[PDB]
Design a protein around this motif. Structure first.
Motif, mmCIF file in Angstrom:
data_model
loop_
_atom_site.group_PDB
_atom_site.id
_atom_site.type_symbol
_atom_site.label_atom_id
_atom_site.label_comp_id
_atom_site.label_asym_id
_atom_site.label_seq_id
_atom_site.Cartn_x
_atom_site.Cartn_y
_atom_site.Cartn_z
ATOM 1 N N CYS A 8 69.385 -63.857 -12.210
ATOM 2 C CA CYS A 8 69.965 -64.929 -11.413
ATOM 3 C C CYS A 8 69.006 -65.341 -10.312
ATOM 4 O O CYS A 8 68.518 -64.475 -9.573
ATOM 5 C CB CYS A 8 71.288 -64.484 -10.797
ATOM 6 N N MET A 11 70.261 -67.074 -4.161
ATOM 7 C CA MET A 11 71.060 -68.136 -3.567
ATOM 8 C C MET A 11 71.333 -67.858 -2.096
ATOM 9 O O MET A 11 70.779 -66.919 -1.520
ATOM 10 C CB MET A 11 72.380 -68.316 -4.322
ATOM 11 N N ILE A 13 74.673 -67.455 0.010
ATOM 12 C CA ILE A 13 76.123 -67.373 0.153
ATOM 13 C C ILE A 13 76.490 -67.636 1.605
ATOM 14 O O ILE A 13 75.889 -67.065 2.520
ATOM 15 C CB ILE A 13 76.644 -66.006 -0.313
ATOM 16 N N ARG A 14 77.477 -68.504 1.821
ATOM 17 C CA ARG A 14 77.854 -68.864 3.179
ATOM 18 C C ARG A 14 79.255 -69.461 3.193
ATOM 19 O O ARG A 14 79.588 -70.294 2.347
ATOM 20 C CB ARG A 14 76.853 -69.858 3.780
ATOM 21 N N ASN A 16 82.168 -68.940 2.371
ATOM 22 C CA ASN A 16 83.232 -68.718 1.401
ATOM 23 C C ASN A 16 82.787 -67.672 0.394
ATOM 24 O O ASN A 16 81.663 -67.715 -0.111
ATOM 25 C CB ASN A 16 83.630 -70.016 0.685
ATOM 26 N N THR A 18 83.941 -67.401 -2.533
ATOM 27 C CA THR A 18 84.042 -67.923 -3.889
ATOM 28 C C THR A 18 82.680 -68.116 -4.542
ATOM 29 O O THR A 18 82.598 -68.157 -5.774
ATOM 30 C CB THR A 18 84.804 -69.247 -3.890
ATOM 31 N N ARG A 19 81.616 -68.242 -3.754
ATOM 32 C CA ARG A 19 80.274 -68.339 -4.304
ATOM 33 C C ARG A 19 79.645 -66.982 -4.572
ATOM 34 O O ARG A 19 78.618 -66.917 -5.256
ATOM 35 C CB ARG A 19 79.370 -69.133 -3.358
ATOM 36 N N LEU A 20 80.231 -65.902 -4.058
ATOM 37 C CA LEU A 20 79.609 -64.592 -4.199
ATOM 38 C C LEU A 20 79.768 -64.043 -5.612
ATOM 39 O O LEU A 20 78.862 -63.379 -6.127
ATOM 40 C CB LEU A 20 80.198 -63.624 -3.173
ATOM 41 N N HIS A 21 80.895 -64.321 -6.259
ATOM 42 C CA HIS A 21 81.122 -63.780 -7.596
ATOM 43 C C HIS A 21 80.280 -64.455 -8.668
ATOM 44 O O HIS A 21 80.514 -64.198 -9.857
ATOM 45 C CB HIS A 21 82.605 -63.875 -7.958
ATOM 46 N N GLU A 22 79.314 -65.301 -8.303
ATOM 47 C CA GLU A 22 78.416 -65.879 -9.294
ATOM 48 C C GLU A 22 77.519 -64.829 -9.932
ATOM 49 O O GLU A 22 76.899 -65.103 -10.964
ATOM 50 C CB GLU A 22 77.563 -66.974 -8.654
#
Lengths: 817, 817
Positions: A8, A11, A13-14, A16, A18-22
């Motif tokens: 991957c 990225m 993450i900030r 939220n 919800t972006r961490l589980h990517e």
């Protein structure tokens, strides 16, 4: 295999979760992991969150102000090694302002390839002093761990074993324990293996594994690859046809080609146009190479080779040199360029260096309110404007509100063309219509311009656009002044002439282009060659002078006037200044070295120097006056700081000024040539010498040159010349009248100041006596009286200006008893 | 009498001895004597030259490079005293580079009133170490005597007496002789008189004589006057009707009046317009006074009073501020002024201060090629131009080739008139014809100007001369952005409009005059209110915005366009930054002081702060885990430098930036108002506290403000709270099973880590024992076993997180034997 997930890209993450589980699948991050600005997050949210597959991180890890995070023991349970390919401010692991954080929990990290660790502002974090950073990171000297809960002795770091005698992991150095958390403690492999790691039993891994391994001595069972990864098998170097990629894994040509294809068009934000070179899929061709679309090999391009610099949204505004730095080395610009240089220093040179290599502009060029520009010469190589993108009104060249713009380019040397659009010029006072018409004829845009496209009332108004020529008639020079004359020019209407202007400046070289000057106005003549006389010039300098007329702006056809050509005039020479710092040193009986410096104002070229040295006789009173009478002397001839510094400097400068406007007109001398030092030979020992020193420039045609500088010196004497030679004869006339006839030191150090005579009775004390020059001359020796008869010895010493001499051999002599 | 000659003003002898004999008669020099640059002079020329009458010199004496001068014993045989009224570089006697000079010869100089002596570069001069400078000059610490023939021990300075026992003058301090030449030696008066001097017999002079006298105690027989000279009689102060003149002599009103008469007209070079003030004929009236022609008294002038500054040859050119310094304070200029300011810094303010007081120009004013000028506002008080002197063409105002000249003066406030001549304006691009017509109507020169006098094609061309008005229609702000609208203006011919310009800058105050800006262009609308939107503004700041149109220059009547008025717009506020440097200090059991600093980005006015402090319970493992088992720890709860500095600063700045664009939305707390410090009361002793700190600006209307900053502290414990209270009871069940029932310290410093018990047999050693929390809880005390029977004493101490406690009183207890 060896990795259940993909790789991957890193990225940010900030704000939220919800972006961490990517990262649900991928196991290796070929980027950087930054988690920051997590305010609404609560500790209960992290209870059911983990990423067990994360193993390898390439760049670094960053955490900053993540509320609710207590420990990373669940977030990154298998983070084995951080490659640290690209560092964050020279840090491969940053943990800054992590409130609510208790312990690290990174118990599976053994190796950090590059960089150090910076942990700071952790008022709750514990378990730091119990970390062996030496075993983790090779070079720990760049660490930074301050302002934490372990800084003050407040953390009760307890790790398993104490209840059973401190087992399950050992200590090291004073001998101190090393442990990660309250449940998991650090694992140290035996020193016998440097970094290959060891299993639970302690058996070492293969040389290619990094950190951990499953089966000892198996390159196919490593978890991390020390050199390069390849289909689950660590290898030292990727064999062909595979190329090393991203410094850690090997790829085929197809993958790099596909990535490049993505990067051409369907990758807008910061893609890397990967090209294969030196068996490496480098992000871009290095310096001195080019990219060939057939196979993407960095072949060495011959000479200047293309470097296309596509612009963001096809528009860039250059305000300062810093904005031009980003465009350095770009030969072709795929876009439009805007110039808005309002100010700066030493422009047109750094700008030329940064932008002179430009050869094409796809869009349009626009110079707008560029107050500091004087010319477009810095676009050295600009040849063609494609003009595929046109501004409103279909404009290709846009010049507006330029105050100091005086020319575009030299059209006897430069070539230019414009494909699409039309030109535009408004509010350019110092640019005459001549260059605009040169543009209509040269660019091929003559048929494109229409009404109001070019302002005919605001461009060529305040400019200097003289077309005729002026010839100097009478030119004579002097040491200070210069008189100048030229042919009397008259415009078609004599009433329209206001006067002449004269420009002159220091011209050391001949690279003067008139692009700092002294301006002098001259009234028109009374209808008699007009001219001017200079008064404040410095002698022996080269001056650049050119005269430009000034004619009023009549409403009819412009009388453009005449400006003469730039000429170089050299002022005459005068007698130089005084040579500086004359110092004389004596090192022998007749050798005296002399040192000096060239004059501060040569006023020409110093052809030769002039030194006059004259022998000075000794002082008169040294002869006829006694030096041993009662009462004598042995003639032993051998902001306040800043304010006073400025005062002394001004005093010296005042006297130098006094020396500078003086208005100028049989001794053994030698003319020194091109040498600042001189020695003298054949001189009497220990004699005063007066040295007169001069600097000179003209020799044969009625020579005249500087005024003298004086200095004096004395030669070293001879320790032998003062010695007494000759037997010391004695004679008594009637009653112990001891007459001493003995020769004088006719070659003394200057002169014989006095004699001293000492005599002693056998076994008795010696008594001394002086002898003056006058007494010695009148008596032709010494006279002794009042001496008891017997046998005596005489010791005679002579004195000179050098000092005391040497007593002669004691010649014992007996007077009758 | 008392002086056979007159007084001669000081001169500058140079290059010829024919000017030196001008002192044939005069005896006192009320100037300075400088002799320098005497090259062709030979020593034989000085053999028959003397000035015996020279006695008194006022300013100083200077000699420099006078060839052929051997000694001054004949030149100045009676120079008694040098007054030193005006010093030469803080020196009253300079002798520099005097070749061929042997000895001074100034044996009649006793007193030097002011300054020191500087003798330097005298390779032949001797007789310097034999000079008592203490007796000559009052303050000898400023002397400078180096680089001479006496610096090195080379002069045999011999003065009369040695042949007869060193008589005719005494010595002083080591005791050393003081003498002037080889024939004349220094004379020292008895110390009993300070400076009045003494005769040959030693009798002192009158108190008013200086240096020498003929008859003791006679003011009428002095040679020099200590205070003031008057008709051969020294006096302390000149009585009326005489005024002290030149600090040393007294004169009547007639002499000063005649000197002023000479100075007004028939004295061109540097005469002093002498005026009588405070009984002194001062060269000029001091500050705050004026000269009245009736009697020349410095009466105190009321307010600004005239200071006429006549110019040399009626023409002065001002190039820089330094040239304007010489004109400072001049109200009326008798001549003409030329301005040629090409460059500088912070002009129009220092120039205004230096020249703003000008009220009249007798000649003409000419502004020529003044590139750095923007306006003539610095001529603050200029009212009338007399114009008695006119240039070629009979001109009074001459403005030429001014690039940045934008206005002359504001004609709604200023008044001006010109008497003679006509105006002139050429090559002034940024000056519209409106001001020139204001000049034709205001100065009264409308009927004087003729054809070609004023250029109608090179003045109002590139200037901004908008006459109409623009009104903003829609204005709304935001925390960052600003949207602006205005009425859609259209010129008479819509094709002649190119677009709008917008200007904005930081506006802390309201003293903005538009005379540093950010320019943004706007395209014309599609024939719909035109407007612009801002994007890069800083919150809570006041901005100055005004919009100016841009219209092409048509050949017909000028469409001057419209420019709006300057308006001030204030941006909205947002939540502030984090408070800086939160530090907590404990000074009591429940008092903890807290310090911090205001946030770096207030983004408004900080109405109040917000502090949240929460009690933190002690660590859990401190309870159930023993701290005295084998193996424990006491819970003692308490250019490279420049490059690294820049790197650390950039790291901190990066994190601050990360904190700046976050994009924002039951604990005992208290809102601090207008105070940066806070104290807390009512806290449990020695307890961990977590302090959350915030800054705030808005309180009532949906309050929102900054993010929290965290810090922690612990209170100081009580040395009493850990003490053990209650009797220690003992009981044995069967066999020396010592049960210890005693009360616990239920108010400890955090908690009781462990107990220790020590017991001792009479006359025997004491043995100690630990007691853990778990063991104490299960046994409800301590259990002792394996103890010999007898009489013992127990010493019990309790420990807490603070440290070791105090052993209780030894309660001796006897178990049965």
């Amino acid at each position: 295999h060896l990795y259940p997930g993909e790789v991957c890209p890193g990225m940010d993450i900030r704000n939220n979760l919800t972006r961490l589980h990517e990262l649900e699948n991928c196991s290796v991050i070929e980027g950087h992991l930054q988690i920051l600005l997590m305010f609404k997050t609560r500790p209960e949210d992290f209870r059911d969150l983990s990423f067990p597959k994360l193993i390898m991180i390439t760049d670094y890890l960053l955490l900053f102000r993540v509320y609710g995070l207590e420990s990373l023991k669940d977030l990154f349970p298998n983070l084995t090694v951080i490659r640290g390919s690209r560092l964050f401010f020279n840090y491969a692991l940053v943990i800054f302002e992590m409130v609510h954080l208790k312990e690290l929990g990174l118990y599976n990290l053994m190796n950090i390839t590059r960089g150090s660790v910076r942990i700071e502002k952790n008022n709750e974090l514990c378990y730091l002093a119990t970390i062996d950073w030496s075993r983790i990171l090779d070079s720990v000297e760049d660490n930074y761990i301050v302002l934490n809960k372990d800084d003050n002795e407040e953390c009760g770091d307890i790790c398993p074993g104490t209840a059973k005698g401190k087992t399950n992991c050992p200590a090291t150095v004073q001998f101190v324990e090393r442990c990660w958390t309250h449940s998991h403690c650090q694992k140290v492999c035996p020193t016998i293996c440097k970094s290959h790691g060891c299993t639970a039993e302690g058996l070492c891994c293969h040389s290619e594994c990094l950190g951990n391994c499953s089966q000892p001595d198996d390159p196919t069972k490593c978890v991390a690859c020390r050199n390069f990864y390849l289909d689950g098998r660590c290898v030292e170097t990727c064999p062909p046809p595979y190329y090393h990629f991203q410094d850690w894994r090997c790829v085929n040509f197809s993958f790099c080609q596909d990535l490049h294809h993505k990067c051409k068009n369907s990758r807008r934000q910061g893609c890397h146009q990967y090209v294969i070179h030196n068996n490496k899929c480098i992000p871009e061709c290095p310096s001195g190479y080019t990219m060939n679309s057939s196979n993407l090999l960095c072949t060495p391009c011959l000479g200047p080779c293309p470097k296309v610099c596509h612009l963001l949204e096809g528009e860039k505004t250059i305000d300062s040199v810093t904005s031009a730095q980003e465009l350095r080395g770009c030969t072709v610009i795929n876009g439009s360029l805007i110039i808005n240089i309002r100010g700066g220093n030493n422009l047109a040179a750094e700008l030329e260096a940064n932008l002179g290599l430009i050869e094409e502009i796809s869009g349009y060029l626009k110079i707008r309110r560029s107050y500091a520009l004087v010319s477009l010469s810095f676009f050295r190589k600009l040849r063609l404007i494609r003009g595929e993108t046109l501004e409103i009104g279909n404009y290709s060249f846009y010049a507006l509100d330029n105050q100091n713009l005086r020319q575009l380019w030299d059209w006897s040397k430069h070539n230019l063309t414009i494909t699409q659009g039309k030109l535009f010029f408004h509010y350019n006072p110092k640019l005459c219509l001549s260059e605009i018409h040169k543009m209509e004829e040269v660019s091929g845009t003559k048929g494109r311009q229409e009404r109001n496209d070019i302002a005919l009332k605001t461009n060529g108004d305040q400019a200097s656009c003289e077309n005729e020529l002026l010839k100097f008639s009478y030119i004579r020079t002097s040491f200070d002044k210069i008189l100048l004359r030229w042919e009397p020019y008259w415009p078609p209407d004599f009433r329209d002439l206001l006067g002449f202007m004269l420009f002159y400046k220091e011209a050391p070289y001949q690279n003067v282009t008139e692009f700092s000057w002294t301006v002098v106005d001259i009234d028109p003549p009374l209808r008699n060659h007009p001219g001017w006389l200079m008064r404040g010039l410095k002698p022996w300098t080269q001056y650049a002078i050119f005269v430009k007329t000034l004619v009023t702006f009549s409403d009819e056809r412009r009388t453009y006037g005449a400006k003469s050509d730039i000429i170089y005039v050299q002022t005459d020479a005068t007698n130089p200044s005084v040579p500086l710092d004359p110092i004389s040193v004596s090192n022998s009986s007749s050798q005296i070295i002399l040192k000096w410096k060239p004059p501060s104002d040569p006023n020409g070229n110093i052809t030769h120097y002039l030194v006059f040295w004259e022998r000075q006789a000794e002082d008169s009173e040294l002869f006829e006056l006694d030096y041993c009478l009662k009462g004598l002397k042995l003639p032993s001839r051998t902001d306040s700081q800043i304010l006073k510094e400025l005062e002394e400097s001004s005093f010296r400068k005042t006297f130098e000024d006094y020396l500078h406007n003086v208005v100028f007109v049989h001794r053994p001398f030698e003319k020194v040539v091109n040498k600042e030092s001189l020695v003298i030979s054949g001189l009497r020992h220990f004699t005063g010498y007066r040295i007169e020193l001069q600097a000179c420039n003209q020799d044969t045609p009625e020579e005249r040159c500087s005024v003298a500088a004086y200095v004096s010196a004395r030669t070293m004497p001879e320790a032998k010349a003062d010695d007494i030679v000759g037997p010391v004869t004695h004679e008594i006339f009637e009653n112990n009248v001891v007459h001493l006839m003995w020769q004088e030191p006719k070659e003394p150090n200057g002169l014989i100041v006095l004699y001293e005579v000492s005599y002693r009775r056998y076994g008795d004390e010696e008594l001394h006596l002086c002898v003056s020059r006058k007494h010695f001359a009148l008596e032709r020796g010494c006279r002794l009286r009042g001496l008891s008869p017997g046998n005596y010895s005489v010791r005679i010493r002579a004195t000179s200006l050098a000092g005391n001499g040497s007593w002669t051999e004691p010649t014992y002599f007996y007077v009758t008893d």
